[PDB]
Design an enzyme around this catalytic site. Structure first.
Site, short mmCIF file in Angstrom:
data_model
loop_
_atom_site.label_atom_id
_atom_site.label_comp_id
_atom_site.label_asym_id
_atom_site.label_seq_id
_atom_site.Cartn_x
_atom_site.Cartn_y
_atom_site.Cartn_z
N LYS A 1 0.82 -1.21 0.00
CA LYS A 1 0.00 0.00 0.00
C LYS A 1 0.86 1.27 0.00
N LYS B 1 5.62 3.57 -1.24
CA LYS B 1 4.75 2.60 -1.88
C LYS B 1 5.45 1.25 -1.83
CE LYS B 1 2.41 1.00 -5.98
NZ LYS B 1 1.02 0.90 -5.44
N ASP C 1 0.24 9.38 -18.46
CA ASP C 1 -0.81 9.46 -17.45
C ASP C 1 -0.78 10.82 -16.75
OD1 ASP C 1 -3.10 8.36 -16.17
OD2 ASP C 1 -1.90 7.52 -14.54
C1 LIG Z 1 7.49 11.49 -14.07
C2 LIG Z 1 8.42 11.18 -12.89
C3 LIG Z 1 9.81 10.80 -13.40
C4 LIG Z 1 10.83 10.65 -12.26
C5 LIG Z 1 10.20 9.91 -11.10
N1 LIG Z 1 10.78 9.45 -10.03
N2 LIG Z 1 9.94 8.88 -9.25
C6 LIG Z 1 8.69 8.96 -9.81
C7 LIG Z 1 7.50 8.44 -9.15
O1 LIG Z 1 6.37 8.70 -9.52
N3 LIG Z 1 7.73 7.67 -8.07
C8 LIG Z 1 6.65 7.10 -7.30
C9 LIG Z 1 6.12 5.87 -8.02
O2 LIG Z 1 5.42 5.01 -7.13
C10 LIG Z 1 4.59 5.57 -6.21
C11 LIG Z 1 3.22 5.44 -6.38
C12 LIG Z 1 2.35 6.01 -5.45
C13 LIG Z 1 2.86 6.69 -4.36
C14 LIG Z 1 4.23 6.82 -4.19
C15 LIG Z 1 5.11 6.26 -5.11
N4 LIG Z 1 6.50 6.37 -4.93
C16 LIG Z 1 7.14 6.04 -3.65
C17 LIG Z 1 7.28 6.76 -5.97
O3 LIG Z 1 8.48 6.84 -5.82
C18 LIG Z 1 8.83 9.65 -11.00
C19 LIG Z 1 7.83 10.03 -12.05
#
Ligand SMILES: C[C@@H]1CCc2n[nH]c(C(=O)N[C@H]3COc4ccccc4N(C)C3=O)c2C1
Length: 260
Positions: free
Chosen positions: A12, A27, A120
């Site tokens: 979660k 996450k 998205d």
């Molecule tokens: C467009 C961006 C490019 C660089 C980047 N670096 N990290 C993310 C990201 O979105 N990381 C979330 C992905 O997973 C998650 C989903 C929901 C809540 C938190 C996260 N966490 C922890 C992330 O690191 C991104 C996108």
């Protein structure tokens, strides 16, 4: 560089507190047995996403790759996402909305310049800090191929309004530009579009036929140039949409002249 974090540093999707670095969003993507030998590929995807470094793009601070547990760790944005802010108690002034739009443009131009198609873009993926500065995120993992696969792996215990009509096709930069057009509308309407839609299939067919967010349903002042920009950006034909660099060159002088 991405930190290889350990659970032992946390007390979660959930807020988390690193015992020396503090507030963070975690996450946890997988919890189960060691059914996974994607370890190299999971870590490399994290490093790749961590190399997308720009003031308006979220920072992946760390990854947890442990025996039966795989987690991503991201900076905390205390204001939440853009829709949460637009609906808050006190309204957001036109000069802040204009700066938000410019920062979205810059972050998206950065991503496209690195060959990354977001796919998205939507207010839920625009995170806002306390100073009302924004960062583009990918909270549905549309760009974390490997981590998204791990999220629906067998042995694991665990939006339409902004989608370009071609996808209701290989996403392109122009798919992101369409999503941005609808974010523009929401920033000024202070709400999600299409509130009068009855059924999902009705909405899909309407949008494919040319239906768009109701410009008349924006109640506050919205500059004519911004109305014109959102209409150009949600043109049915993706080849008619501008690029984010083309958007920035039109929008930046206007922002300086009339919004800043
Ligand atoms: C467009 C961006 C490019 C660089 C980047 N670096 N990290 C993310 C990201 O979105 N990381 C979330 C992905 O997973 C998650 C989903 C929901 C809540 C938190 C996260 N966490 C922890 C992330 O690191 C991104 C996108």
């Amino acid at each position: 560089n991405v930190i290889k974090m350990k659970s032992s540093d946390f007390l979660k999707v959930s807020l988390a507190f690193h015992r020396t670095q503090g507030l963070m969003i975690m996450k946890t993507v997988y919890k189960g047995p060691n059914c996974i030998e994607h370890n190299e590929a999971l870590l490399e995807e994290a490093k790749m996403m961590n190399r997308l470094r720009h003031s308006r793009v979220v920072k992946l601070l760390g990854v947890i790759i442990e025996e039966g547990k795989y987690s991503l760790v991201m900076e905390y944005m205390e204001k939440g996402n853009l829709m949460h802010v637009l609906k808050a108690e006190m309204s957001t002034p036109l000069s802040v909305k204009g700066r938000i739009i410019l920062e979205i443009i810059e972050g998206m131009a950065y991503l496209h310049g690195k060959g990354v198609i977001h796919k998205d873009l939507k207010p839920e993926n625009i995170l806002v800090d306390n100073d009302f500065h924004i960062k583009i995120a990918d909270l549905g993992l549309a760009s974390f191929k490997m981590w998204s696969k791990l999220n629906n792996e067998e042995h694991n215990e665990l939006t339409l309004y902004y989608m370009a009509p071609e996808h209701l096709a290989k996403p392109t930069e122009k798919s992101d530009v369409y999503s941005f057009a609808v974010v523009l509308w929401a920033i000024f309407a202070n709400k999600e579009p299409y509130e009068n839609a009855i059924a999902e299939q009705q909405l899909i067919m309407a949008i494919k036929s040319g239906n768009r967010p109701d410009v008349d349903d924006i109640t506050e002042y919205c500059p004519r140039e911004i109305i014109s920009l959102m209409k150009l950006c949600w043109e049915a034909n993706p080849e008619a949409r501008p690029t984010f660099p083309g958007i920035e060159e039109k929008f930046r002088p206007f922002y300086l002249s009339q919004l800043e």
